[PDB]
RNA sequence: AACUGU
RNA sequence: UCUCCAGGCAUACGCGUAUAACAACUCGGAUAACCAUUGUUAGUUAAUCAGAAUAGGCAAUAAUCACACUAUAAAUCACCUAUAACUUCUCUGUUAACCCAACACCGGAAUGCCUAAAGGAAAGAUCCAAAAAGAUAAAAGGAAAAGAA
């Protein structure tokens, strides 16, 4: 009958391990926590400088570089898989606002450098109203469905950690801090989660990049600032789920000045960093409304789509969360990973001159239709 | 009867306790003279707190206390306990080391735990009895 | 007045 | 690894290489270990962080979760009408344990976030002198507790 005690590390040592039973009190509290309003609190009360990270960015590989933060695998081409006229729609879809951008007078632009990026704006704004009021008869989600406009979607990770080079702490091991802000030219939001597209724990041979050298070689610089992770809404909004994401390139990353800038082959890589970035940090804070988080992983995989355009065309892409462990502690066995699926993207049309518009692609829009139509089961 | 080590007695205990758990891992510490002294004599009744048995509640209570390292209390009951069921006392070897040259010259001593596996400690040896006084001795004896 | 090594 | 302590991280300002690695052990640290010292070499990466046209016409009614509601200390360019210009990402800031006090001075030093997950160490060794200082304990007694004027 002997009570030998646990054979553990003490608390109050100055050391790795006493320290490491000093994080899990800490750790267990978080698990205590019974709001998820009061897990985001806790997870970000104390602010750290933490890596900058731009949905749209002009890196090389950027998208191989937020996959490696990620952990998110990129499977070319789109996820494993009532009658409306398509071609009542290839004009439902209202050319009527590019017959009004030529018709609608307004204000010139002082700059005369935004007439184009102001157009583009326009034109998208209006035909994603007139899209939503069209499916909605279809597919009763839309009607259900919340449509936000040029909000802005947070979410904060940790993924490995680093050695302190030099000053006062050096030597200490502080964590890899990363933030995504993004603000969607339009995104949908609904009340149900979207049908999964792969089950959880899909495997496939692929690999996640793998980075050489420091985040910092890359462009890139750490902050010190309030972490927050938003899925566009705060919690007390019902549509905390979504179904569509629509982004827009600017001028600069558009394709003709990147072909002249001789980076023609990342015009892909700028479509697919935004798409992962975006879909990554959106999804991954829905889960956390739901009260999963790093040392809870999600038990049902989440999955979003977004729609990325450069003004004439257009790629779509669609995204699935299945670990919310990105930690070095977290993450230390974890065999789930994050599957994100992309399309190349296709013009939408060629012209629009007289007061029409013509050239232009059902293709695109019946993946729009498609996308539209998909309902959770 | 007791010497003053530490900022306190609260931490004269601690040193102390620091320096029988060090004690119990290695078997074999070295430190100043006048500190390895005031340790000898905690470190011989831990060993009879031993022998009582692993089920005395005092023990455990006494052991969990003083050995930080939890993974030590088996080692004491099963390792130091069992060796020195035979002996009645003396667990604890005690040497002077030549004092230390950090320019402090403290005096140096070294304690070890008896019948340990370690390598054998440089030991003085008594002069032989073929010496020639011895001899001369060892004739009275015959005598005698 | 109490309080206390005043 | 253990014992114990509990203002930490960013920016501003100032400082200006004190940063990092190597090599030295003479000088600097009011002693060593080790460097903050000596010599040599390296360093801080930004379209997102920070810094670097003109002439007329015309404006009554604070804020305080701004609604009610009052008050007194009385508290906010725009947009129109004409003229002029017509395709753009360079330059500069980014290191540090750092500053002002003759000093590695127990002093002074703004703001934001948070309160330990961050950040730290009172023990150069021995002795237990007297005397002195600080802290703790008081048998009986109470000027030889927090109550009144």
Redesign the interface.
């Known amino acids: 009958?002997?009570?030998?005690?646990?054979?553990?590390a003490?608390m109050t040592?100055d050391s790795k391990a006493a320290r490491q039973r000093r994080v899990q009190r800490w750790q267990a509290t978080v698990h205590a926590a019974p709001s998820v309003d009061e897990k985001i609190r806790i997870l970000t009360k104390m602010q750290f400088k933490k890596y900058v990270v731009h949905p749209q960015i002009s890196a090389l590989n950027a998208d191989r570089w937020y996959q490696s933060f990620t952990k998110t695998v990129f499977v070319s081409g789109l996820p494993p898989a009532p009658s409306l006229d398509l071609a009542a729609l290839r004009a439902a879809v209202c050319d009527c606002i590019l017959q009004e951008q030529v018709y609608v007078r307004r204000r010139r632009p002082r700059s005369l450098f935004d007439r184009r990026q102001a157009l583009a704006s326009s034109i998208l704004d209006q035909v994603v109203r007139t899209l939503v009021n069209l499916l909605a008869p279809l597919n009763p989600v839309l009607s259900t469905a919340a449509l936000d406009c040029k909000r802005s979607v947070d979410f904060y990770w940790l993924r490995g950690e680093e050695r302190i080079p030099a000053g006062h702490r050096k030597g200490h091991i502080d964590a890899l801090r990363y933030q995504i802000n993004d603000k969607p030219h339009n995104q949908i939001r609904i009340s149900k989660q979207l049908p999964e597209f792969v089950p959880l724990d899909y495997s496939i041979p692929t690999e996640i990049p793998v980075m050489k050298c420091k985040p910092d070689k890359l462009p890139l610089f750490r902050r010190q600032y309030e972490n927050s992770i938003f899925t566009g809404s705060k919690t007390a909004d019902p549509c905390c789920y979504g179904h569509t994401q629509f982004h827009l390139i600017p001028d600069r990353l558009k394709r003709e000045r990147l072909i002249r800038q001789n980076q023609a082959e990342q015009v892909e890589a700028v479509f697919r960093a935004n798409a992962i970035a975006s879909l990554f940090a959106w999804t991954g804070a829905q889960a956390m409304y739901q009260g999963f988080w790093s040392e809870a992983d999600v038990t049902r995989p989440f999955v979003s789509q977004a729609v990325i355009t450069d003004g004439k065309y257009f790629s779509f892409f669609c995204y699935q969360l299945n670990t919310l462990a990105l930690t070095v502690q977290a993450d230390q066995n974890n065999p789930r990973k994050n599957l994100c699926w992309g399309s190349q993207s296709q013009p939408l049309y060629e012209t629009v001159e007289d007061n029409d518009v013509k050239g232009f692609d059902d293709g695109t829009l019946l993946q729009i239709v498609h996308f539209l139509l998909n309902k959770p089961r | 009867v007791y010497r003053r080590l530490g900022l306190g007695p609260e931490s004269r205990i601690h040193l102390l306790r620091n320096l029988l758990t060090g004690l119990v891992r290695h078997e074999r510490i070295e430190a100043t003279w006048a500190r390895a002294d005031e340790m000898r004599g905690y470190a011989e009744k831990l060993i009879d707190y031993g022998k009582l048995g692993?089920?005395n509640e005092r023990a455990?209570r006494m052991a969990?206390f003083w050995l930080?390292?939890?993974?030590l209390?088996?080692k004491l009951?099963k390792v130091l306990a069992p060796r020195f069921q035979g002996q009645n006392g003396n667990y604890t070897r005690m040497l002077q080391i030549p004092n230390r040259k950090e320019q402090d010259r403290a005096k140096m001593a070294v304690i070890e735990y008896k019948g340990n596996y370690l390598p054998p400690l440089p030991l003085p040896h008594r002069d032989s009895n073929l010496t020639l006084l011895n001899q001369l001795l060892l004739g009275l004896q015959q005598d005698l």
Do not use: L
Request: aromatic share 10%; charged share 30%.
């Open positions: 009958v002997a009570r030998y005690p646990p054979i553990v003490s040592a | 692993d089920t455990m969990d930080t390292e939890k993974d209390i088996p009951f």
